[PDB]
Design an enzyme around this catalytic site. Structure first.
Site, PDB file in Angstrom:
ATOM      1  N   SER A  74       0.815  -1.185   0.029  1.00 59.21           N
ATOM      2  CA  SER A  74       0.046  -0.083   0.048  1.00 59.21           C
ATOM      3  C   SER A  74       0.811   1.264  -0.101  1.00 59.21           C
ATOM      4  O   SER A  74       0.203   2.290  -0.399  1.00 59.21           O
ATOM      5  CB  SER A  74      -1.012   0.023   0.970  1.00 59.21           C
ATOM      6  OG  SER A  74      -1.979  -1.060   1.011  1.00 59.21           O
TER       7      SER A  74
HETATM    8  C1  LIG Z   1      -2.080  -1.830   1.828  1.00 59.12           C
HETATM    9  O1  LIG Z   1      -0.927  -2.707   2.291  1.00 59.12           O
HETATM   10  C2  LIG Z   1      -3.166  -3.041   1.788  1.00 59.12           C
HETATM   11  N1  LIG Z   1      -2.888  -4.189   1.901  1.00 59.12           N
HETATM   12  C3  LIG Z   1      -3.799  -5.249   1.602  1.00 59.12           C
HETATM   13  O2  LIG Z   1      -4.461  -5.014   0.692  1.00 59.12           O
HETATM   14  C4  LIG Z   1      -3.072  -6.755   2.065  1.00 59.12           C
HETATM   15  N2  LIG Z   1      -3.237  -7.196   0.623  1.00 59.12           N
HETATM   16  C5  LIG Z   1      -2.193  -8.216   0.297  1.00 59.12           C
HETATM   17  O3  LIG Z   1      -1.403  -8.595   0.891  1.00 59.12           O
HETATM   18  N3  LIG Z   1      -2.613  -8.825  -0.979  1.00 59.12           N
HETATM   19  C6  LIG Z   1      -1.648  -9.906  -1.572  1.00 59.12           C
HETATM   20  C7  LIG Z   1      -1.509 -10.031  -2.899  1.00 59.12           C
HETATM   21  N4  LIG Z   1      -2.650 -10.064  -3.492  1.00 59.12           N
HETATM   22  C8  LIG Z   1      -2.654 -10.523  -5.110  1.00 59.12           C
HETATM   23  C9  LIG Z   1      -1.599  -9.623  -5.755  1.00 59.12           C
HETATM   24  C10 LIG Z   1      -3.593  -9.061  -3.136  1.00 59.12           C
HETATM   25  O4  LIG Z   1      -4.384  -8.835  -3.752  1.00 59.12           O
HETATM   26  C11 LIG Z   1      -3.531  -8.413  -1.946  1.00 59.12           C
HETATM   27  O5  LIG Z   1      -4.426  -7.609  -1.608  1.00 59.12           O
HETATM   28  C12 LIG Z   1      -3.769  -7.017   3.128  1.00 59.12           C
HETATM   29  C13 LIG Z   1      -2.826  -7.339   4.289  1.00 59.12           C
HETATM   30  C14 LIG Z   1      -3.268  -7.943   5.386  1.00 59.12           C
HETATM   31  C15 LIG Z   1      -4.872  -8.152   5.389  1.00 59.12           C
HETATM   32  C16 LIG Z   1      -5.576  -7.904   4.385  1.00 59.12           C
HETATM   33  C17 LIG Z   1      -5.265  -7.314   3.134  1.00 59.12           C
HETATM   34  C18 LIG Z   1      -4.269  -2.533   2.605  1.00 59.12           C
HETATM   35  N5  LIG Z   1      -3.599  -1.037   3.581  1.00 59.12           N
HETATM   36  C19 LIG Z   1      -3.229  -1.858   4.748  1.00 59.12           C
HETATM   37  C20 LIG Z   1      -2.651  -0.772   5.470  1.00 59.12           C
HETATM   38  O6  LIG Z   1      -1.996  -1.424   6.629  1.00 59.12           O
HETATM   39  O7  LIG Z   1      -2.752   0.517   5.275  1.00 59.12           O
HETATM   40  C21 LIG Z   1      -4.856  -2.346   5.216  1.00 59.12           C
HETATM   41  C22 LIG Z   1      -4.539  -3.488   6.235  1.00 59.12           C
HETATM   42  C23 LIG Z   1      -5.543  -1.234   5.726  1.00 59.12           C
HETATM   43  S1  LIG Z   1      -5.152  -3.172   3.603  1.00 59.12           S
END
Ligand SMILES: *C(=O)[C@@H](NC(=O)[C@H](NC(=O)N1CCN(CC)C(=O)C1=O)c1ccccc1)[C@@H]1N[C@@H](C(=O)O)C(C)(C)S1
Length: 324
Positions: free
Chosen positions: A61
């Site tokens: 992210s």
């Molecule tokens: C930003 O970092 C974002 N994180 C996620 O969406 C994270 N997602 C993933 O790890 N993945 C794996 C890879 N793929 C296929 C390529 C994906 O689509 C994917 O989305 C995630 C991590 C933990 C739990 C759910 C999702 C969002 N920003 C973070 C942050 O800390 O800001 C959130 C937890 C709010 S989601």
């Protein structure tokens, strides 16, 4: 003749070690840069190799500010524009967020960290346009920082991209950066739209940047990124008393056998302050926290808060607003 500030180096080392111990994590790194010169003010790793420079990760992210910046810089998107942020499919892959918002404006995409919304901003551009942009940020490019074993990262050629890859790259998967490269890319936001070189030697001559976005765009993106550290934002734990902070949180699932798994995470937090005219960039990453939470906000946010707050104090920068 090193640019490192030993007081910042000590602070970063202490705060990182406390966070790695508390979260029972595998490893981590802190980088502090001078936001207008690209000089390294601190760089610390848990014991072993210089991971900050040797190791590339999927940024997740914390990549999101950049497609946002490009969209605004192009004139095709305005900050007030709204987007459909419902989960959607590209072939059999899903693009989705951790909470469903039907629609978000650009500030919302940033504040809440919408994978969907970010992917919609990227989709307005061709594979070649987005590749050229990532390349211009230094993705896949050698910094020649002065460190041995410096990773170039990975940016696959756009001629090979499937439609799902353009989308996932926009929210930080399917390309790879070192933490130092990631901190360097944020100079585009802090140095009025120009990417700076990075160095650990005291600078004697003004560094020459490469123009990536307009200064006006950079300024708008820094204002959007303040929402991350204010109420409603994913990065409220990184707020620094007396300052406005622009930042971005990232939590990424790690790859085990080329499959993403849901029990292993990398937490990243990057931001700059004072937000309107930043002096420093602070970047923090902690690999595989196993205790006391795994989200960026809870794991890396408090490290960022202490290192940024301490750094501004050490550098003699006054609070821009009353303490509380
Ligand atoms: C930003 O970092 C974002 N994180 C996620 O969406 C994270 N997602 C993933 O790890 N993945 C794996 C890879 N793929 C296929 C390529 C994906 O689509 C994917 O989305 C995630 C991590 C933990 C739990 C759910 C999702 C969002 N920003 C973070 C942050 O800390 O800001 C959130 C937890 C709010 S989601």
């Amino acid at each position: 003749a090193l640019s490192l500030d030993q007081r910042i180096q000590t602070l970063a080392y202490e705060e990182l070690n406390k966070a790695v111990e508390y979260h029972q994590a595998k490893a981590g790194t802190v980088v502090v840069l001078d936001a207008r010169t690209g000089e390294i003010l601190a760089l610390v790793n848990t014991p072993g190799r210089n991971r900050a420079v040797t190791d590339m990760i999927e940024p997740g992210s914390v990549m999101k500010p950049f497609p946002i910046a490009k969209a605004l810089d192009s004139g095709k998107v305005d900050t007030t524009d709204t987007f459909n942020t419902l989960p959607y499919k590209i072939g059999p892959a899903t693009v989705q967020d951790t909470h469903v918002y039907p629609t978000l404006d650009v500030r919302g995409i940033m504040q809440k960290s919408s994978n969907v919304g970010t992917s919609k901003l990227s989709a307005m551009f061709t594979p070649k346009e987005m590749y050229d942009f990532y390349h211009d940020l230094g993705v896949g490019v050698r910094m020649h920082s002065g460190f041995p074993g410096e990773s170039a990262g990975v940016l696959r050629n756009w001629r090979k991209w499937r439609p799902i890859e353009q989308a996932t790259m926009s929210f930080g998967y399917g390309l790879q950066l070192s933490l130092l490269q990631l901190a360097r890319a944020y100079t585009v936001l802090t140095h009025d739209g120009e990417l700076l070189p990075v160095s650990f030697e005291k600078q004697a001559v003004a560094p020459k940047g490469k123009r990536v976005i307009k200064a006006s765009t950079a300024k708008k993106v820094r204002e959007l990124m303040v929402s991350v550290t204010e109420a409603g934002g994913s990065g409220i734990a990184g707020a620094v008393d007396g300052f406005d902070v622009g930042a971005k949180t990232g939590t990424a699932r790690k790859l085990v056998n080329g499959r993403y798994v849901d029990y292993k995470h990398v937490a990243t937090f990057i931001g700059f302050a004072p937000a309107k005219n930043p002096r420093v960039i602070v970047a923090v990453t902690i690999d595989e926290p196993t205790a006391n939470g795994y989200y960026s906000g809870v794991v890396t946010g408090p490290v960022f808060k202490q290192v940024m707050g301490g750094s501004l104090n050490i550098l003699g920068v006054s609070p821009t607003k009353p303490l509380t």
